[PDB]
Nucleic acid binder design. Structure first.
Ligand SMILES: [Mg+2]
Ligand SMILES: [Mg+2]
Ligand SMILES: [Mg+2]
Ligand SMILES: [Mg+2]
Ligand SMILES: [Mg+2]
Ligand SMILES: [Mg+2]
Ligand SMILES: [Mg+2]
Ligand SMILES: [Mg+2]
Ligand SMILES: [Mg+2]
Ligand SMILES: [Mg+2]
Ligand SMILES: [Mg+2]
Ligand SMILES: [Zn+2]
Lengths: 224, 155, 104, 60, 43, 86, 129
RNA sequence: CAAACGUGCUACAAUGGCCAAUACAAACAGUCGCCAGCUUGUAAAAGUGAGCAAAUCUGUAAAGUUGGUCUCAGUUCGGAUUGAGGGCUGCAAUUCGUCCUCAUGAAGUCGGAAUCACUAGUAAUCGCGAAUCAGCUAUGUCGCGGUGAAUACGUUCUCG
RNA sequence: GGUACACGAAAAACCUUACCUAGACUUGACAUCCUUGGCAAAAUUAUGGAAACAUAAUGGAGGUUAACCGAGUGACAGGU
């Protein structure tokens, strides 16, 4: 049957919000919600070869702060800090010149056990006509060797260009979905294939959170 | 399948007459969940019973209700279809319950005026074993002796 | 010695609770490190809004989940502040989520 | 015919009553939340991602 | 024996006066100001 | 229904045409789409072509039709007989 | 030596103050006669069941303050409030009340309406054909 | 719109209709808003006009209690439909907004074959609030409280 | 059918609107890429107008083109 979104079911209990701001009124509350969505999608869609895992937004009456964690920030930084000013001008055009931007590119630790870049690597393999079984086996074993818990990958679509759509599941370990205390990271991606659309879903388990609290604690940023 | 009888809401204390049955019949004539209206109806009807029969209403009410109590109950069992009514002895709690439901149902159909006089007329008509609740009890009683044969087989 | 601000009524409200408790603790600690008599960090009723939205895209209005957004609120009124407190009040840095309603 | 409907809503009309509210991410017209300017089915994906601060699931 | 006329005519006169009065007082709003989110009075 | 202070309502394009058309003796059908303008005493004697949705149906106003709406004296839909489904 | 009780029922608080007296209890609810405040029914007595089965001759003056609920909830609240004040005067007395469960919260509150339902657990009329 | 079905509302009534006085909630919402009070109006409402960015100000609680009247009738039941006069929103109310006032007073007196929901603060029922919304016969939807029942012997039958 | 029928639609007078009848438009009301300039779009008042739209007006924030305002221009935009 249908299941509730794993990330959305754990928000406000064990997971903090990706955007943290309080608006003045309901008219400026709509702009500040669409603006971060355009901004967030920009980082992920283009500038993808960087494996950006998550972008958080923090806004006050007039000051915009962006915190972008990546595995390879060299592509953002560019040649002698080139690409970075460009993205800054891009961001300024999106929100407006009247505000203050405060980019804070932060390098990420333990990049693998993040469901965003793993899904991105999966999506890249499928678009590159790489066989799904072979592509999947390498990603699962490398993630598992990194020293994490079970990973759940759902790859539904017109598998291998077929005319009848299927779905392939692959569990490897204990995935307690009914538990709220687990640190489960969820992400979804659209693999654009020449024969249609492929849906990839990645559930990753990063241990048990035995410290109560709405996070306020670094996530997959700490090193081994 | 249930094979379990969880606590049956047990309450009895009565104030005006200390007769649990008064509280039961109040709840029976209750409609739309208005306790005050039904209690006024019963107490005004009880007040009406003082002015006619010149005796204690509780004694008259028990004498009516004890008279309405049925003895046999004809239930339903299968036999190639339909049911050859099998007579069974009803417990005392249900026995009183069936009596109270019947008194109210025949009271709310009389040609009389406000249910005060209506239920009062109905109850007084049942204290002399000649009324509408009696006939129903008579009817259910008369039907059971005729269908005495199938009493041995129940299920 | 001076006051320059009598009856400074600071009001706090935020979508989150724990951040709000942490911030009031920091505010009280700073304001008691200076010479101000805090009346007390009392809690006010939390205004909760709930929006009901149909899960399904096309049909089945019956299946509808629900969401909530709580506006936790606190009050704290300072009697006399003076520059000794006011100047130290400038370096507090309140985490974004928390909202201030200083009414002077 | 959606994008053009979206563009016309952005442009101001000649009468006040000619102005309606559409969703700002997609172009859905019906079931739009004025508190957020977002229709009911765009509000779900953003709420399930944490973009809106403080909107958690309800248990009552 | 007026046969309608007089009463509805007065209403028409009011409407024509309204139509000929029409002044482009186009506006959109009412109460104004008192719209902010405050700060630490200078942070 | 409609308030008093407000009064009646004509689009004033019909009103300007009617004043011009009342002065001109040789009146011809007036093609108006404003079925919403109420008939005012000066319209009397003229003929209009109200847009029913498809065509312009001609209405000759009289000293009696004054007060209602110009579209009320024309139809929009038509139904005159069903057909046995079976 | 006064006694204080805090009852509750159906979202209705109660502050009952028990004061020793010997000139008739003179029960009082919100500075008003209870026979004018509550319906003229056993509910007016419903509050006195624990003040009856034990005793009321001790003429305890009752000072009731209830803010919330209807009248049955308030009566239950003052009953619970009254019993909790009685649990400070005479231990044997306060016990003989439990012999009837009159010192326990009823735990009965109105349920929340659920979506798709005409009430807490109800459901639209079902049509099969 | 000759018709048929589904889901709800209103009823066929003195457990009630009408009139007068009057007691007791919770939750939510509010600055193009909530709108107190005052003046006018048979009323919908208009004008004046504070107060409230809100545990502060505003959004009349109704059932319930008492008193009066109606005396079982197609009625002081029931409100449909229709005519006229008004109020509000809006450029704009005929197609096709709703409210008030007056006028009229269809059917219907417990509903065939057959069916639905339900195991306590629950049925039944009485109000209150919010969403989308300039306005809207939403009687819809999502919520909140007031009163508050009956029954479960048993699995032989019935559906899964 | 259960699992459609106070369902999508948490508000169809205009708008919504995707439908019909008409009056108008064609790298288009919206977008990028390219050669090329910016010394505007608005809003509003006139006349003709059912209104689209035309002919005339205050020629407009700004910032020298930032954004947009355009020309030229074919790939194309667009489809509820
Ligand atoms: Mg589209
Ligand atoms: Mg609208
Ligand atoms: Mg006060
Ligand atoms: Mg008033
Ligand atoms: Mg009537
Ligand atoms: Mg009309
Ligand atoms: Mg059950
Ligand atoms: Mg289906
Ligand atoms: Mg239309
Ligand atoms: Mg210039
Ligand atoms: Mg230039
Ligand atoms: Zn949308």
């Amino acid at each position: 049957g249908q299941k509730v979104n794993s990330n959305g079911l754990r928000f406000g209990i064990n997971k903090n919000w990706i955007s943290r701001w309080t608006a003045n009124s309901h008219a400026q509350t709509a702009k500040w919600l669409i603006e971060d969505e355009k901004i967030r999608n920009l980082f992920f869609v283009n500038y993808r070869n960087a494996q950006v895992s998550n972008v958080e937004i923090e806004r006050t009456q007039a000051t915009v702060d962006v915190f972008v964690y990546a595995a390879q920030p060299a592509f953002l930084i560019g040649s002698e800090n080139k690409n970075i000013q460009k993205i800054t001008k891009q961001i300024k055009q999106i929100i407006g010149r009247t505000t203050n931007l405060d980019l804070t590119i932060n390098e990420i630790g333990s990049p693998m056990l993040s469901a965003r870049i793993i899904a991105r690597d999966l999506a890249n393999a499928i678009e590159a006509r790489v066989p799904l079984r072979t592509a999947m086996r390498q990603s699962l074993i490398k993630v598992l060797k990194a020293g994490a818990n079970g990973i759940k990958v759902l790859v539904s679509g017109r598998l291998n260009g077929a005319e009848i759509a299927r779905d392939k599941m692959y569990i490897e370990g204990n995935m307690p979905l009914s538990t709220l205390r687990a640190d489960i990271d969820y992400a979804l991606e659209k693999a654009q294939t020449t024969y249609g659309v492929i849906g990839v879903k990645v559930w990753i388990n990063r241990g048990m959170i035995y410290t109560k609290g709405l996070n306020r604690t670094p996530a997959h940023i700490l090193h081994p | 399948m249930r094979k379990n009888r969880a606590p049956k809401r047990t309450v009895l204390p009565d104030p005006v007459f200390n007769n649990t049955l008064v509280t039961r019949i109040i709840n029976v004539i209750m409609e739309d969940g208005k306790k005050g209206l039904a209690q006024r109806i019963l107490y005004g009807a009880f007040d009406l019973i003082e002015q006619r029969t010149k005796e204690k209403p509780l004694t008259v009410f028990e004498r009516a209700v004890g008279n309405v109590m049925p003895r046999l109950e004809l239930r339903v069992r299968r036999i190639a279809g339909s049911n050859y009514q099998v007579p069974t002895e009803v417990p005392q709690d249900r026995k009183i319950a069936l009596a109270l439901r019947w008194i109210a149902m025949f009271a709310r159909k009389r040609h009389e005026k406000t249910m005060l006089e209506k239920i009062a007329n109905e109850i007084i008509d049942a204290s002399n074993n000649t009324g509408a609740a009696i006939k129903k009890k008579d009817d259910t009683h008369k039907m059971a002796e005729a269908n005495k044969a199938f009493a041995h087989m129940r299920w | 010695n001076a006051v320059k601000y009598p009856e400074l009524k600071i009001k706090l409200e935020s979508y989150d609770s724990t951040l709000l408790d942490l911030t009031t603790k920091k505010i009280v600690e700073v304001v008691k490190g200076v010479d101000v008599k805090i009346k007390g960090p009392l809690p006010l009723p939390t205004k909760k809004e709930v929006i009901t939205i149909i899960r399904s895209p096309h049909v089945d209005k019956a299946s509808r989940e629900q969401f909530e957004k709580n506006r936790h609120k606190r009050l704290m009124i300072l009697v006399d502040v003076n520059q000794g407190a006011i100047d130290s009040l400038k370096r507090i840095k309140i985490p974004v989520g928390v909202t201030l309603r200083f009414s002077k | 015919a959606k994008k053009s409907l979206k563009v016309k809503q952005t442009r101001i009309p000649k009468f006040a009553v000619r102005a309606y509210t559409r969703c700002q991410r997609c172009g859905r017209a019906r079931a739009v939340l004025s508190h957020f300017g977002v229709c009911r089915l765009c509000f779900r994906e953003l709420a399930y991602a944490g973009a809106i601060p403080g909107v958690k699931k309800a248990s009552w | 024996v007026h046969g309608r006329a007089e009463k509805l005519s007065g209403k028409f006169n009011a409407g024509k006066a309204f139509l000929e009065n029409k002044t482009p007082k186009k506006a959109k709003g009412k109460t104004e100001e008192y719209t902010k989110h405050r700060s630490l009075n200078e942070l | 229904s409609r308030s008093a202070k407000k009064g009646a309502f004509v689009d004033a394009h019909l009103l300007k045409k009617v004043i011009d058309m009342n002065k001109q003796e040789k009146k011809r059908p007036i093609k108006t789409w404003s079925r919403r303008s109420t008939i005012f005493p000066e319209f009397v004697g003229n003929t209009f072509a109200v847009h029913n949705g498809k065509t312009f149906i001609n209405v000759y106003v009289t000293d009696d039709m004054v007060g209602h709406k110009l579209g009320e004296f024309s139809p929009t839909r038509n139904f005159k007989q069903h057909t046995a489904n079976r | 030596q006064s006694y204080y009780g805090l009852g509750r029922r159906k979202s209705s608080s109660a502050k009952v103050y028990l004061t020793p007296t010997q000139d008739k209890g003179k029960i009082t609810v919100n500075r008003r006669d209870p026979s004018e405040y509550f319906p003229n029914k056993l509910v007016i007595q419903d509050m006195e069941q624990p003040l009856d089965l034990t005793d009321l001759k001790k003429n305890f003056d009752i000072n009731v303050v209830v803010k919330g609920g209807g009248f049955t909830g308030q009566a239950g609240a003052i009953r619970l409030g009254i019993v909790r004040a009685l649990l400070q005067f005479n231990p044997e007395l306060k016990k003989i009340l439990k012999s009837k469960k009159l010192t326990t919260r009823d735990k009965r509150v109105k349920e929340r309406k659920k979506f798709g339902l005409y009430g807490a657990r109800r459901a639209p009329q079902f049509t099969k054909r």
